[PDB]
Design an enzyme around this catalytic site. Structure first.
Site, PDB file in Angstrom:
ATOM      1  N   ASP A  21      13.799 -14.717 -12.462  1.00  0.00           N
ATOM      2  CA  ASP A  21      12.411 -14.989 -12.813  1.00  0.00           C
ATOM      3  C   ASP A  21      12.304 -14.762 -14.317  1.00  0.00           C
ATOM      4  O   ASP A  21      12.302 -13.621 -14.783  1.00  0.00           O
ATOM      5  CB  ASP A  21      11.474 -14.081 -12.014  1.00  0.00           C
ATOM      6  CG  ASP A  21       9.997 -14.305 -12.333  1.00  0.00           C
ATOM      7  OD1 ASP A  21       9.667 -14.915 -13.366  1.00  0.00           O
ATOM      8  OD2 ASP A  21       9.142 -13.857 -11.540  1.00  0.00           O
ATOM      9  N   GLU A 113       9.233  -1.770 -12.959  1.00  0.00           N
ATOM     10  CA  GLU A 113       8.721  -3.015 -12.398  1.00  0.00           C
ATOM     11  C   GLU A 113       8.403  -2.665 -10.952  1.00  0.00           C
ATOM     12  O   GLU A 113       9.226  -2.884 -10.049  1.00  0.00           O
ATOM     13  CB  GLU A 113       9.709  -4.170 -12.534  1.00  0.00           C
ATOM     14  CG  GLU A 113       9.090  -5.532 -12.239  1.00  0.00           C
ATOM     15  CD  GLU A 113       9.111  -5.844 -10.754  1.00  0.00           C
ATOM     16  OE1 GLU A 113       8.082  -5.552 -10.099  1.00  0.00           O
ATOM     17  OE2 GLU A 113      10.136  -6.384 -10.242  1.00  0.00           O
ATOM     18  N   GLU A 122       5.064  -2.581  -0.898  1.00  0.00           N
ATOM     19  CA  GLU A 122       6.232  -1.728  -1.168  1.00  0.00           C
ATOM     20  C   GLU A 122       5.823  -0.294  -1.495  1.00  0.00           C
ATOM     21  O   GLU A 122       6.656   0.609  -1.410  1.00  0.00           O
ATOM     22  CB  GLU A 122       7.129  -2.265  -2.293  1.00  0.00           C
ATOM     23  CG  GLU A 122       7.633  -3.707  -2.055  1.00  0.00           C
ATOM     24  CD  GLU A 122       8.627  -4.174  -3.107  1.00  0.00           C
ATOM     25  OE1 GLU A 122       9.501  -3.376  -3.509  1.00  0.00           O
ATOM     26  OE2 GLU A 122       8.545  -5.343  -3.532  1.00  0.00           O
ATOM     27  N   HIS A 270       8.297 -15.384  -9.441  1.00  0.00           N
ATOM     28  CA  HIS A 270       8.823 -15.158  -8.095  1.00  0.00           C
ATOM     29  C   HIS A 270       7.853 -14.411  -7.182  1.00  0.00           C
ATOM     30  O   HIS A 270       8.154 -14.256  -5.997  1.00  0.00           O
ATOM     31  CB  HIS A 270      10.159 -14.411  -8.172  1.00  0.00           C
ATOM     32  CG  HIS A 270      10.019 -12.928  -8.270  1.00  0.00           C
ATOM     33  ND1 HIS A 270       9.608 -12.296  -9.422  1.00  0.00           N
ATOM     34  CD2 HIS A 270      10.228 -11.949  -7.355  1.00  0.00           C
ATOM     35  CE1 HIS A 270       9.578 -10.987  -9.215  1.00  0.00           C
ATOM     36  NE2 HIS A 270       9.945 -10.752  -7.970  1.00  0.00           N
TER      37      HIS A 270
HETATM   38  C1  XJ3 Z   1       9.302  -3.735  -6.865  1.00  0.00           C
HETATM   39  N1  XJ3 Z   1       9.513  -5.004  -7.584  1.00  0.00           N
HETATM   40  C2  XJ3 Z   1       9.936  -6.069  -6.646  1.00  0.00           C
HETATM   41  C3  XJ3 Z   1       9.620  -7.456  -7.272  1.00  0.00           C
HETATM   42  N2  XJ3 Z   1       9.728  -8.487  -6.215  1.00  0.00           N
HETATM   43  C4  XJ3 Z   1       8.461  -8.553  -5.445  1.00  0.00           C
HETATM   44  C5  XJ3 Z   1       8.645  -9.685  -4.374  1.00  0.00           C
HETATM   45  C6  XJ3 Z   1       8.274 -10.999  -4.667  1.00  0.00           C
HETATM   46  C7  XJ3 Z   1       8.451 -12.002  -3.717  1.00  0.00           C
HETATM   47  C8  XJ3 Z   1       9.013 -11.686  -2.479  1.00  0.00           C
HETATM   48  C9  XJ3 Z   1       9.394 -10.370  -2.201  1.00  0.00           C
HETATM   49  C10 XJ3 Z   1       9.994  -9.958  -0.836  1.00  0.00           C
HETATM   50  N3  XJ3 Z   1      10.821 -10.776  -0.193  1.00  0.00           N
HETATM   51  C11 XJ3 Z   1      11.309 -10.414   1.002  1.00  0.00           C
HETATM   52  N4  XJ3 Z   1      12.235 -11.326   1.707  1.00  0.00           N
HETATM   53  C12 XJ3 Z   1      12.476 -12.652   1.140  1.00  0.00           C
HETATM   54  C13 XJ3 Z   1      11.391 -13.522   1.577  1.00  0.00           C
HETATM   55  C14 XJ3 Z   1      11.687 -15.020   1.436  1.00  0.00           C
HETATM   56  O1  XJ3 Z   1      12.992 -15.408   1.982  1.00  0.00           O
HETATM   57  C15 XJ3 Z   1      14.068 -14.578   1.446  1.00  0.00           C
HETATM   58  C16 XJ3 Z   1      13.793 -13.086   1.644  1.00  0.00           C
HETATM   59  C17 XJ3 Z   1      10.969  -9.161   1.551  1.00  0.00           C
HETATM   60  C18 XJ3 Z   1      11.548  -8.731   2.887  1.00  0.00           C
HETATM   61  C19 XJ3 Z   1      10.087  -8.328   0.814  1.00  0.00           C
HETATM   62  C20 XJ3 Z   1       9.618  -6.916   1.311  1.00  0.00           C
HETATM   63  C21 XJ3 Z   1       9.904  -5.712   0.635  1.00  0.00           C
HETATM   64  C22 XJ3 Z   1      10.715  -5.550  -0.655  1.00  0.00           C
HETATM   65  N5  XJ3 Z   1       9.343  -4.731   1.350  1.00  0.00           N
HETATM   66  O2  XJ3 Z   1       8.715  -5.328   2.426  1.00  0.00           O
HETATM   67  C23 XJ3 Z   1       8.859  -6.632   2.425  1.00  0.00           C
HETATM   68  C24 XJ3 Z   1       8.301  -7.589   3.488  1.00  0.00           C
HETATM   69  N6  XJ3 Z   1       9.621  -8.770  -0.352  1.00  0.00           N
HETATM   70  C25 XJ3 Z   1       9.211  -9.367  -3.141  1.00  0.00           C
END
Ligand code: XJ3
Length: 333
Positions: A21, A113, A122, A270
């Site tokens: 990203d 972050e 989270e 993202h």
């Molecule tokens: C702390 N700075 C993190 C910056 N990123 C934030 C972010 C941005 C966009 C998406 C997610 C995301 N993706 C997840 N899986 C993908 C989904 C689409 O297909 C491929 C796998 C999961 C499981 C989670 C999650 C977390 C961690 N805890 O619970 C959950 C629910 N979060 C996280």
């Protein structure tokens, strides 16, 4: 649940999705490097450093010592990068949760972050705030503040997507079996999922309400219960199908303030954006007032239970909705 959470961050592929990203990673680098006097010869704490990228940016800005705390098995990969980049004298990886490690000294600035999708998923903002026990008086926080925006939207085709999927269960003879008694439960299941995806801004029906967390001032416990009142003045008439959410954070440095936005008017990140649908949508005419509360209640799955109650004041018609932020529909996939 926490075991799975930290396992998720042990994957280099997850680190890579965040690092790739460019809006996120380039804006962090810009905020740190263009505020180089907040880092030059300073002591810094990097909360949840993952692969360590932000700690390397603090080192590029001249920090004297960086403590990089990481609780997943990514800590071992960060130490490999610190050695291979010849920085073992300035970055010290500390494996563990920021609530459980010992730092050897107080720090001048905390970088992190900690933003989940919809900002609050989270519950890492609490870990970030918890880390202020290591912050010197008039130390700084990067990011310094976080703004959540909420706005009502109309999106009939997104709404109808739901009953399309749930009407699978309205079959009186699926291989001779009557499924129809589970149709209400299937509808409820789909509407309890926040929809993570971007969208066209023309769905938005009113100017957003802003709710601000000041990370310098907030306490960890302030994030257990997040009550966001709203009164929207509708700019357009239509069927309100739910509330759209995005967030911005600001790095308020001594030289300048740098903003990282996930707004739908800004280039895609993202994080995309999030929409919480109303199983019972509300009719509003331009000029009406849509008022209510979005209440976020922290839960034991690293996330929040979302309660959104809304009403159109001129009509009295109301909608109340419960969503499970931990289990959203990642519609962008
Ligand atoms: C702390 N700075 C993190 C910056 N990123 C934030 C972010 C941005 C966009 C998406 C997610 C995301 N993706 C997840 N899986 C993908 C989904 C689409 O297909 C491929 C796998 C999961 C499981 C989670 C999650 C977390 C961690 N805890 O619970 C959950 C629910 N979060 C996280």
């Amino acid at each position: 649940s926490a075991v799975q959470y930290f396992q998720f961050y042990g994957y280099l592929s997850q680190q890579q999705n965040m690092m790739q990203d460019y809006v996120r990673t380039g804006t962090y680098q810009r905020a740190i490097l263009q505020n180089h006097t907040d880092f030059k010869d300073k002591i810094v704490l990097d909360v949840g450093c993952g692969s360590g990228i932000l700690s390397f940016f603090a080192a590029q800005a001249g920090a004297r010592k960086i403590y990089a705390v990481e609780a997943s098995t990514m800590a071992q990969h960060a130490e490999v990068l610190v050695k291979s980049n010849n920085l073992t004298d300035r970055i010290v990886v500390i494996p563990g949760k920021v609530e459980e490690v010992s730092l050897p000294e107080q720090v001048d600035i905390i970088i992190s972050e900690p933003m989940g999708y919809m900002l609050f998923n989270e519950r890492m903002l609490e870990s970030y705030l918890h880390a202020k026990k290591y912050l010197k008086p008039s130390g700084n926080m990067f990011p310094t503040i976080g703004d959540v925006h909420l706005a009502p939207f109309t999106d009939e085709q997104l709404y109808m997507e739901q009953f399309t999927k749930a009407n699978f269960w309205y079959q009186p003879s699926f291989h001779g079996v009557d499924l129809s008694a589970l149709r209400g439960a299937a509808v409820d299941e789909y509407f309890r999922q926040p929809v993570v995806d971007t969208f066209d801004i023309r769905i938005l029906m009113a100017k957003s309400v802003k709710y601000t967390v000041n990370f310098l001032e907030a306490k960890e416990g302030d994030l257990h219960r997040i009550e966001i009142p709203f009164k929207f003045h509708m700019l357009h008439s239509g069927l309100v199908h739910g509330l759209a959410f995005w967030f911005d954070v600001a790095f308020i440095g001594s030289i300048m303030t740098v903003w990282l936005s996930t707004a739908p008017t800004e280039p895609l990140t993202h994080w995309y954006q999030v929409r919480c649908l109303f199983q019972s949508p509300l009719f509003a005419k331009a000029g009406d007032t849509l008022s209510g509360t979005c209440l976020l209640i922290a839960n034991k799955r690293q996330s929040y239970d979302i309660s959104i109650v809304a009403q159109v004041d001129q009509t009295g018609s109301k909608s109340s909705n419960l969503l499970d932020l931990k289990n959203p529909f990642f519609r962008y996939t």
